Amino acid sequence: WCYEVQAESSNYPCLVPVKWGGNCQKDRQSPINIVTTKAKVDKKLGRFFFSGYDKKQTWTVQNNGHSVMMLLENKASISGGGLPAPYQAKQLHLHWSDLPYKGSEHSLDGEHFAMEMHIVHEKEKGTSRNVKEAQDPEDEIAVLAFLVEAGTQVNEGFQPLVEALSNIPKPEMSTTMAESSLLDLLPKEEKLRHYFRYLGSLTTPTCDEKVVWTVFREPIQLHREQILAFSQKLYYDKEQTVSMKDNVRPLQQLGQRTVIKS
């Protein structure tokens, strides 16, 4: 499967977003545009609690041909934020572009940002459900999304990741980034108080609708050069001819769903 941009310049067939298979053609898809003013306020949406997010550590990061992804190996978890139970971190990856107004999947009141970061987690234990219900739990996977925009200061917390890119230009490559903690990436805990919530799917095949999304309103800031690093050092093909950018899924319709916030 492919993103539009790469389908045009690829040397072999591939399904574009509108022609994706799986549950990608269903009714509870992501990303969506969030009309901040239409989202209902909910008190049950308390703050989140992080475990392991602060310990420096080496991570395995890799170029899967669709994005840059670092494996989290259940070495951290979250709770609170209205979540019915703890969720352990599996992986993290990003979506970006070289133009400041078209790098994120979700949008706020029609505005798109430089990049978007997805931290995927899965429900801790298994809870009893009835056979008659939907096969997969609608809140099975919990992802945290952060919007990224250009700033003046060089973001030191992202430096290790940016460096690592040099070692994985082509697909299938891997490496070990310098010791860092997940907390080094996110903004200060006090800014993580406001966020939007809604049920949806994954933004890649098979687009399974078993995700509880969380989009924080506070954007992470990176120096322009740091953002461009991704487009400049990563490639979609082994021949190193097509830069990796615009790896974003076109918006989907909200439908019967409603969004709530804190």
Q: Given the rule CB under 5 A, which of 4-12, 41-49, 74-82, 113-121 is the region that contacts Zn ion?
A: 113-121
- Does position 118 bind Zn ion by CB under 5 A? yes
Active site residue 66: yes
Give me the least distance between CB of 152 and Zn ion, in Å please. 27
Q: Is 204 annotated as a binding residue?
A: yes
Alpha-carbon distances, residue 140 vs 39, 45, 209, 211 (angstroms): 23, 18, 9, 6
How many whole angstroms separate alpha carbon 155 and alpha carbon 139? 33
Q: Given the rule CB under 5 A, which of 1-9, 45-53, 199-207, 226-234 is the region that contacts Zn ion?
A: 199-207
Count of residues engaged in binding Zn ion, rule: CB under 5 A: 2
Neighbouring C-beta atoms of residue 8, cutoff 10 Å: 10
Contact string (CB under 5 A) for Zn ion, positions 202-231, x = contact: -x----------------------------
Q: Is 112 annotated as a binding residue?
A: no
Phi, psi of 225 (to 5 degrees): -55, -35
How many whole angstroms separate alpha carbon 97 and alpha carbon 151? 16
Strand partners for 144? 119, 214
Give me the least distance between CB of 130 and Zn ion, in Å please. 30
How many whole angstroms separate alpha carbon 100 and alpha carbon 38? 26
Q: Given the rule CB under 5 A, which of 21-29, 48-56, 117-125, 162-170 is the region that contacts Zn ion?
A: 117-125
How many whole angstroms separate alpha carbon 124 and alpha carbon 256? 29
Q: Find the helix or strand (DSSP H, E) in which 212 lies.
A: strand 211-216
How many whole angstroms separate alpha carbon 75 and alpha carbon 181? 11
- Does position 249 bind Zn ion by CB under 5 A? no
User: Of the residues 66, 121, 194, 223, which is catalytic?
Assistant: 66
Give me the least distance between CB of 211 and Zn ion, in Å please. 10
In the numeric block, the tokens 């980034």 are attached to: 177
Q: Is 93 annotated as a binding residue?
A: yes
Query: Can you give the binding site for Zn ion, defined by CB under 5 A?
Result: 118, 203
Residues with catalytic function: 66
Residues making up the binding site: 93, 95, 118, 203-204
Binding-site positions for Zn(2+) read 93, 95, 118
